């Protein structure tokens, strides 16, 4: 702390209520990061850096002005939503500021129409918007979100050459893809999570996998899943075991960093930023557990950033970005594990001296190696100021403490799991999602696409409207699992049962009846405001003419 | 001329950059360049964000073509099964007709899979020369080296948790009216074509000339704010809020210049909290580096203090300051206290004209606080940097002004810089009220007995005035009627 952020009671009393009596006839960094002694740091009080530059050619400066085709149906539906590329109806700068800051130009508002009502829209435009919104229920209040790519610019040419005969345009491609993902979002929102049957199936799958291949995430150890960073199984009102919904990991609020529990469904960092795709931990092969981003985006285990001595967190309440990877020991990276023998990541070592058998943290937890945090806390273990303090303790296979049972079976379990993984590296049942949990779009989406191509009036073959529906499920796989559109809604009906939905409808009815009386009162208030405005405006003028007839 | 060959095999080529950077010529020439490069060319060098994605796609589809040296250990399903119930209830039961949920014609096969990969491979040169070339193991290091905001290229300072595929590329493009980031100039063109409204969300709680301040809430715009945080961390070193953005409230400064649409360009921002017990009034403040010492930071600090004053509290910034925060924000204190001293002098002069200096009025740190908006432990630093507080050798501390000329010179010199100032009469604001959830939609750990029907009767007690000038004049006149100390003490 420096001498600008401490207090003024480090003066003599100067209680600040005592009265003072006024009369008349370059760089001062003053202390250190934390507790220490006075020191000046004018060399650390530094600000400047290299530069900043200005580009000389605009985006719209680089564009091939050529246009080979035009549409013959509902060109106004395109000219509304996109940027109609002409010299449209504009105003003059000698009038704009007077009109939008003048004597009767009010401030804006989050409810002020996202359109410009000062200009008019035709009636053909509104009829076309109604025609489009009538294609399918989930198409009400539509807007083209999707954005064009350097590979879609190539796909478009092949589509134009094969099927649509130089008629499809970029805007219509973007519209087709946007409709496809709108419909997929509305299909996904309503998937019911689970019931007793699927719960039993998943718990039995977990137990029967652990019985053979071992586990680390806390699954399979017992009937009730444990934590995923400290293997804890207790809870209380101050920090609860909060389960996730993409995966099924559990965590403690303070062991993971959940400052507040949302009222809907909880989604962890990996199932929130990216999707549950089997990611790449930098420090160990296995990818299943509680992950957290680093200062750049990669995904490291919480169980690994703690135990690696050079890794720490930058905020002990949020547990936000893992830090300190760029200064891990070259010897640490040159070590190689002894249970899975894989040549990736960084390992920790045995404790007892005259031993240098290393192993990954998650491989250790899978095998069954002795690891104990000691009397430390998760927060101190994370803070990295533990170096001058005592240490944490583990052991290898043949250095187990007294009573720690055999783990040869453990290393065999781990080797078997990684061996099966390495082998797998190389009433009508219908498959509807790829092995990586990405979707594949069914017949109805192609039907909707045909209806839209009809609306715009192109030569539409069903093969041409099934090609795009194929290519969608592959563009949504190249990307990892992230939806191609920036849009998303916070709604999660999902896990709701039937009676709960019934009660929710019953209460929504009451709130709906109430808001109408409220709206009546609101419009009465508005009318009264207009009345009093006009009254005052007339009264001013009449009193003026009475006080001065001239 | 156009091309020239030397005698030492150093060939000069001249061209036209306008044509070279085109978005159509790029794909045209990439399509024919990409097969000319032998597909057995071993790229043993670094790992691009592009090649990593392509090679992961191949390894997932199980295709027999590999060029990278980093084999993923678990990049596929752990237990691939084809008898689970997931294929008997297609789409969770959300579609009911068999002709409608049958996918016999929409499953991709090897042929279109290979054609897709060919489409992907034929774009490489253009994807690169769009995402990584500037118009003017190495995985732990981020590659981002510019940020193209309006049309300028803004070198960052620190590293933000942008997604992996954005951090492997060394240019990001951000749309100011929306704060969305993309890694390609073509995609940026497409998006600036689509996006139409030229205004942030939220209301407009101030306006004067060009400058305007929009009050974006926190839990209603959970994307605008989540991108503003990532844009902030690239310049603000010590900050660790990126996703839990609901308990916060953002106040955004925009500069308007004038389709005929009103264009409101982002200029800076400061944040705030809805309920804190440390008596702060600000969390982070930022101005985009395209300024040149123009006054918007002092503007926004004066604004935060106006909000605290109109709320009738005291406050200070979140304390872990920076070396560029404090050097700019310990001048604000000096000028504030100089202004208040001149105000006290000029208000006493109207009645102390016929009198003598024999009496010394008694001013206090609480009575400077209630005029300024800041706490006494900051008025002390103001007076210290102004060199006016004396602990001479009852009278343990005094405020001695050797000559008003130095102080009025300080104020006039700071005023000559023509900074923009806040005008208290253009603010359309009312301090926010918080229900049984404190401005969030979440945790349950007061009771639902608030009922909020008060705040209407608070006209009753005419003591706590609603205006600011009223309380200012009250403090300036009432508490300064006391008989002054006789000057007979010392020299």
């Amino acid at each position: 702390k420096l001498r600008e952020e401490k207090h003024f009671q480090d003066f003599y009393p100067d209680l600040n209520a005592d009265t003072l009596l006024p009369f008349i006839v370059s760089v001062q960094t003053k202390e250190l990061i934390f507790k220490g002694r006075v020191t000046t740091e004018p060399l650390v009080l530094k600000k400047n850096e290299v530069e900043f530059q200005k580009c000389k050619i605009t985006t719209n400066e680089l564009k091939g002005k050529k246009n080979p085709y035009c549409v013959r149906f509902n060109e106004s539906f395109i000219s509304r939503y996109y940027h109609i590329n002409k010299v449209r109806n504009r105003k003059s700068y000698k009038q704009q500021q007077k009109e939008f800051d003048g004597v009767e130009a009010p401030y804006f508002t989050k409810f002020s129409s996202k359109e410009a009502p000062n200009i008019t829209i035709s009636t053909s435009t509104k009829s076309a918007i109604q025609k489009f919104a009538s294609i399918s229920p989930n198409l009400v209040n539509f807007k083209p979100q999707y954005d064009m790519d350097e590979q879609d610019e190539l796909y478009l040419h092949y589509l134009n050459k094969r099927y649509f005969k130089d008629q499809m345009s970029h805007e219509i491609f973007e519209i087709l893809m946007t409709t496809l993902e709108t419909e997929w979002f509305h299909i996904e929102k309503h998937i019911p999570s689970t019931n007793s049957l699927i719960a039993r199936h998943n718990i039995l799958r977990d137990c029967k996998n652990y019985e053979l291949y071992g586990s680390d995430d806390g699954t399979g150890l017992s009937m009730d899943q444990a934590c995923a960073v400290c293997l804890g199984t207790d809870s209380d009102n101050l920090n609860t075991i909060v389960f996730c919904d993409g995966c099924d990991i559990a965590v403690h609020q303070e062991c993971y960093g959940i400052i507040f529990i949302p009222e809907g469904k909880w989604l962890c960092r990996r199932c929130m930023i990216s999707k549950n795709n089997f990611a790449t931990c930098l420090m160990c092969p296995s990818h299943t557990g509680a992950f957290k981003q680093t200062d750049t985006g990669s995904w490291v285990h919480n169980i690994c950033a703690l135990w690696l001595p050079e890794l720490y967190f930058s905020n002990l309440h949020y547990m936000e970005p893992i830090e300190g990877v760029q200064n891990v020991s070259v010897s640490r990276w040159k070590l190689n594990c002894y249970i899975c023998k894989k040549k990736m990541g960084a390992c920790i070592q045995c404790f007892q001296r005259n031993c240098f058998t290393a192993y990954h943290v998650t491989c250790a937890r899978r095998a069954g190696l002795y690891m104990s945090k000691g009397k430390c806390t998760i927060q101190e273990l994370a803070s990295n100021q533990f170096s001058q303090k005592y240490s944490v303790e583990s052991f290898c296979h043949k250095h187990a403490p007294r009573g720690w049972q055999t783990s040869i079976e453990g290393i065999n379990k781990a080797r078997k799991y990684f061996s099966l993984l390495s082998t797998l590296q190389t009433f009508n049942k219908t498959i509807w999602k790829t092995p990586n949990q990405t979707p594949v779009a069914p017949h109805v989406f192609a039907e909707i696409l045909q209806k839209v191509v009809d609306f715009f009036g192109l030569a539409n073959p069903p093969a041409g409207a099934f090609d795009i529906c194929k290519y969608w499920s592959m563009k949504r796989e190249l990307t990892g699992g992230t939806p191609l559109t920036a849009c998303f809604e916070n709604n999660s009906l999902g896990s709701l049962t039937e009676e709960q939905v019934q009660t929710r409808i019953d209460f929504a009815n009451d709130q709906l009846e109430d808001l109408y009386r409220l709206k009546e009162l609101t419009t009465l208030v508005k009318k009264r405001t207009q009345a009093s405005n006009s009254l005052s405006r007339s009264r001013k003028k009449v009193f003026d003419i009475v006080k001065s007839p001239q | 001329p156009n091309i020239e060959v030397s005698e030492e095999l150093k060939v000069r080529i001249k061209y036209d950059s306008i044509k070279f950077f085109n978005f159509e010529r790029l794909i045209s020439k990439s399509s024919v360049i990409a097969p000319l490069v032998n597909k057995n060319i071993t790229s043993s060098g670094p790992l691009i964000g592009f090649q990593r994605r392509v090679n992961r796609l191949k390894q997932t589809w199980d295709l027999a073509t590999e060029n990278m040296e980093y084999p993923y250990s678990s990049d596929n399903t752990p237990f691939r099964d084809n008898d689970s119930w997931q294929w008997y209830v297609p789409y969770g039961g959300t579609i009911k007709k068999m002709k409608d949920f049958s996918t016999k014609r929409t499953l991709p096969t090897w042929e279109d899979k290979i054609k897709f990969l060919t489409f992907l491979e034929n774009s490489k040169s253009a994807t690169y020369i769009n995402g990584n070339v500037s118009l003017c193991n190495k995985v732990w290091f981020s590659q981002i080296e510019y940020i193209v905001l309006r049309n300028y290229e803004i070198k960052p300072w620190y590293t933000s948790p942008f997604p992996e595929h954005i951090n492997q590329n060394k240019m990001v493009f951000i749309c100011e009216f929306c704060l969305k980031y993309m890694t390609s100039r073509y995609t940026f063109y497409r998006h600036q074509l689509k996006c139409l409204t030229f205004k942030p969300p939220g209301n407009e709680i101030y306006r004067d000339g060009k400058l305007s301040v929009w009050e974006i809430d926190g839990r209603e715009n959970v994307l605008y704010c989540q991108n503003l945080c990532l844009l902030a961390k690239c310049f603000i070193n010590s900050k660790t809020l990126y996703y839990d953005v609901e308990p916060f409230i953002f106040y955004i400064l925009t500069e308007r210049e004038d389709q005929n649409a009103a264009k409101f360009h982002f200029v800076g921002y400061f944040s705030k909290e809805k309920f804190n017990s440390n008596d702060y009034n600000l969390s982070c403040i930022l101005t985009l580096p395209i300024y040149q010492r123009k006054g918007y930071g002092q503007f926004l600090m004066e604004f935060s203090y106006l909000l605290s004053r109109k709320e009738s509290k005291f406050g200070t910034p979140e304390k872990p300051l920076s070396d560029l925060g404090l050097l700019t924000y310990r001048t604000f204190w000096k000028i504030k206290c100089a202004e208040v001293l001149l105000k006290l002098r000029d208000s006493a002069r109207r009645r102390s004209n016929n009198k003598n200096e024999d009496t010394f009025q008694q001013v206090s740190l609480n009575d400077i606080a209630k005029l300024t908006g800041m706490i006494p432990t900051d008025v002390v630093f103001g007076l210290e940097q102004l060199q006016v507080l004396y602990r001479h050798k009852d009278f343990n501390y005094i405020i001695k002004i050797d000559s008003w000329n130095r102080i009025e010179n300080i104020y006039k010199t700071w005023s000559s810089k023509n900074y923009p100032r806040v005008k208290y009469d253009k603010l359309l604001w009312e301090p926010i009220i918080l229900g049984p959830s404190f401005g969030i939609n979440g945790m349950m750990n007061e009771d639902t007995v608030s009922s909020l029907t008060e705040y209407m009767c608070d006209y009753k007690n005419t003591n706590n005035d609603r205006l600011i000038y009223q309380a200012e004049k009250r403090v300036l006149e009432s508490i300064h009627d006391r008989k002054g100390i006789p000057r007979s003490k010392f020299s």
């Binding site: - | 900050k239 979140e318 872990p320």
Partner: peptide
């Protein structure tokens, strides 16, 4: 109810 600021303290 616990208030936590959008910032982190000094390291050493």
């Amino acid at each position: 109810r616990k208030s936590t600021g959008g910032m982190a303290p000094r390291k050493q």
